[PDB]
Amino acid sequence: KMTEEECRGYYYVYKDGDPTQMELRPRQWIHNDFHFDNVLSAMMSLFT
Amino acid sequence: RIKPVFIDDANFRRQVSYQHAAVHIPTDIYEGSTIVLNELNWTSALDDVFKKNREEDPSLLWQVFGSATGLARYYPASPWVDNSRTPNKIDLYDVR
Amino acid sequence: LPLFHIALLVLFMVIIYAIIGLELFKGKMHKTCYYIGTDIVATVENEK
Amino acid sequence: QPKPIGVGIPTINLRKRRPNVQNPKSQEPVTLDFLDAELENDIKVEIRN
Numbered sequence: 050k051m052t053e054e055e056c057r058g059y060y061y062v063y064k065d066g067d068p069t070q071m072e073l074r075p076r077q078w079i080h081n082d083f084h085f086d087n088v089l090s091a092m093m094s095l096f097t
Numbered sequence: 098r099i100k101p102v103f104i105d106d107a108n109f110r111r112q113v114s115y116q117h118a119a120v121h122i123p124t125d126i127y128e129g130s131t132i133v134l135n136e137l138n139w140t141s142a143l144d145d146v147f148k149k150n151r152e153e154d155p156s157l158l159w160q161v162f163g164s165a166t167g168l169a170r171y172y173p174a175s176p177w178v179d180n181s182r183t184p185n186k187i188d189l190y191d192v193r
Numbered sequence: 194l195p196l197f198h199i200a201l202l203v204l205f206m207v208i209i210y211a212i213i214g215l216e217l218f219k220g221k222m223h224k225t226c227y228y229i230g231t232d233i234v235a236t237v238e239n240e241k
Numbered sequence: 242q243p244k245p246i247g248v249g250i251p252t253i254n255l256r257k258r259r260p261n262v263q264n265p266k267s268q269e270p271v272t273l274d275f276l277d278a279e280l281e282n283d284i285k286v287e288i289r290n
């Protein structure tokens with residue numbers, strides 16, 4: 050899912066990459082903890 | 098959403114409602130998107146013909162429309178055998 | 194060339210600490226908890 | 242019978258099945274041939290044909 054409006058609902062995760070072992074998780078639009086949205090966040094990311 | 102009465106009826110080993118039709122949407126398909134929501138109204142006109150077919154032949158079983166978008170509108174209305182994640186078990190049912 | 198003595202000191206310290214660890218923690222990290230009746234290691238989301 | 246059609250010897254490996262994975266059950270149809278529902282003769286083959 051490539052858009053925020055697309056990233057809604059639930060989806061399957063597979064444990065150890067086995068197609069017969071799946072678990073439901075809700076999908077959420079996630080922002081990276083260290084980003085470059087403004088100069089302050091960019092400076093924090095560059096310091097890290 | 099709709100809360101049906103769900104009387105218990107024979108020829109269906111479960112509780113069914115004849116006042117409307119039930120809609121099944123696959124778990125990994127988000128209900129409420131533009132494609133799914135557009136399908137729901139134009140498929141909502143099938144309930145009248147579902148009721149007409151039922152009343153013409155009372156001994157008639159499930160009538161289903163399986164959409165190319167993944168939806169499945171079936172009559173009479175009845176809860177799904179395996180709901181999504183209310184219990185630990187999940188269902189993998191795609192009408193396509 | 195002048196770093197030869199420091200290299201010898203580092204090598205000797207590595208040897209000493211390796212032998213100490215060999216005597217202390219040998220055969221200790223061979224036990225983990227799997228799921229009961231299976232051979233699948235039991236972990237959580239972000240735990241190695 | 243309402244039972245699904247079996248294929249081969251059923252082999253399971255319970256040492257790699259987690260208790261909470263919800264494996265799929267089945268989707269196959271009950272396709273039982275006429276010659277496999279009764280004892281088969283040569284007359285039955287020609288009748289079926």
Ligand SMILES: *[C@@H]1O[C@H](CO)[C@@H](O[C@@H]2O[C@H](CO)[C@@H](O[C@@H]3O[C@H](CO)[C@@H](O)[C@H](O)[C@@H]3O)[C@H](O)[C@H]2NC(C)=O)[C@H](O)[C@H]1NC(C)=O
Nearest residue numbers: 131133134135136137138139140141142143144145146170
């Ligand atoms: C999907 O939803 C839309 C909107 O809820 C449905 O359109 C609505 O259809 C009803 C009846 O066909 C309309 O009611 C009528 O409104 C006129 C005035 O426009 C009034 O003179 C009539 O007496 C009657 O009350 C309603 O206005 C209309 N809404 C809109 C926004 O157009 C649509 O029918 C639904 N899909 C299907 C397949 O039914």
